[PDB]
């Protein structure tokens, strides 16, 4: 009864059935992490909630170069309590791995439980601004996604991408205007952040306002070229 | 007190069911999408079809713009009157 449809990228599917929906093919079947629904069509598929994860919001907002492919290594900064990092582990599958990072402790415990559930997730519960304590653990990621809230966002991204990014690599930022400035217009703040990344050698390619999902949040996709 | 308890129970019933309904629904984004280029000749030369390597409605559609090589509704029953009817039914609910 339900119909599957591939996305513009790999590992992301769209269910056209009684209702249109965005789904991901399970690597682990029959076990839900945060009580999300599922669909079997027979193999298993898991709903991606764009309101509750800032990555699928950029997906439904349309994004050409999303660097997460299946057989790749992705570093997730700000994986709090595990939802979207479970989704990106689900879309990378067994070959690709995901190095999750978090600092706090109750989302840390939830992330540790979910990393006991899933094999591709490898969790770090360290200060995201001190990259050495997982420099001793992580090797040469292919692409970085980051969703933090500390206002030195370009600072921590420059640090982690100088230490871990593959050359010609990919880097995805989520930016919260109401947290970084909260007085000037969000377009001006995002242009200032784009300039900061361009200074710190991220050649940007696009940005995108997550309009119907969050207030004043944007996603910036850029590449890493000829650096270290 | 008993009246207010009854109204409060009804309100929480409807709040939880509205949460689940909006969780199972899906919307379309309407956001600003900028694309950074490096040369103004290319900036004047820009075309979204030529960029994404797609066609007309694929350009104007957001959640899926599959390329021409990715491309290269009879399964659903009465796709001109029924499917949109059920979608609008869920939205109205």
């Amino acid at each position: 009864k339900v119909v599957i449809e591939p996305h513009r990228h790999a590992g992301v599917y769209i269910a056209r059935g009684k209702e249109d929906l965005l789904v991901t093919k399970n690597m682990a079947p029959g076990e839900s992490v945060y009580g999300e629904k599922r669909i079997s069509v027979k193999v298993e598929y898991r709903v991606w909630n764009p309101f509750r994860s800032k990555l699928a919001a950029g997906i439904m907002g349309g994004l050409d170069e999303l660097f997460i492919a299946p057989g790749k290594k992705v570093l997730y900064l700000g994986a709090a309590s595990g939802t979207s990092v479970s989704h990106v582990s689900d879309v990378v599958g067994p070959e690709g791995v995901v190095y999750a990072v978090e600092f706090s402790h109750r989302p840390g415990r939830e992330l540790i439980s979910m990393a006991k559930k899933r094999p591709n997730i490898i969790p770090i519960i360290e200060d995201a601004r001190h990259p050495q304590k997982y420099r001793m653990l992580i090797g040469m990621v292919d692409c970085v996604f980051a969703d933090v809230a500390q206002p030195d966002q370009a600072r921590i991204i420059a640090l982690n991408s100088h230490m871990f990014l593959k050359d010609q690599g990919g880097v995805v930022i989520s930016i919260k205007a109401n947290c970084i400035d909260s007085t000037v217009d969000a377009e001006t703040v995002f242009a200032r952040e784009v300039q900061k990344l361009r200074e710190e050698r991220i050649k940007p390619l696009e940005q995108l306002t997550l309009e119907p999902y969050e207030r004043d949040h944007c996603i910036v996709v850029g590449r890493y070229m000829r650096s270290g | 007190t008993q009246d207010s308890n009854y109204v409060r129970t009804l309100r929480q019933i409807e709040l939880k069911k509205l949460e689940k309904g909006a969780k199972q629904l899906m919307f379309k984004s309407s956001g600003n999408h900028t694309i950074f280029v490096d040369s103004r000749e290319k900036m004047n030369e820009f075309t979204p079809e030529k960029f994404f390597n797609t066609t007309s409605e694929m350009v104007n559609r957001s959640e899926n713009r599959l390329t021409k090589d990715q491309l290269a509704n009879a399964s659903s029953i009465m796709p001109k009157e029924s499917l949109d009817k059920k979608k609008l039914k869920k939205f109205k609910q």
């Binding site: 449809e5 056209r16 249109d20 | 066609t55 409605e57 694929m58 559609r61 899926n64 599959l66 021409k68 491309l71 290269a72 509704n73 659903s76 796709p79 949109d84 979608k87 609008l88």
Partner: peptide
Amino acid sequence: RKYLNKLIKRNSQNLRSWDLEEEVRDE
């Protein structure tokens, strides 16, 4: 070439028939 173009057009027509709307869009 033209055959490929027609095939792409057919697939696009299928996708459009999947996800299309008239005044249903504004509604």
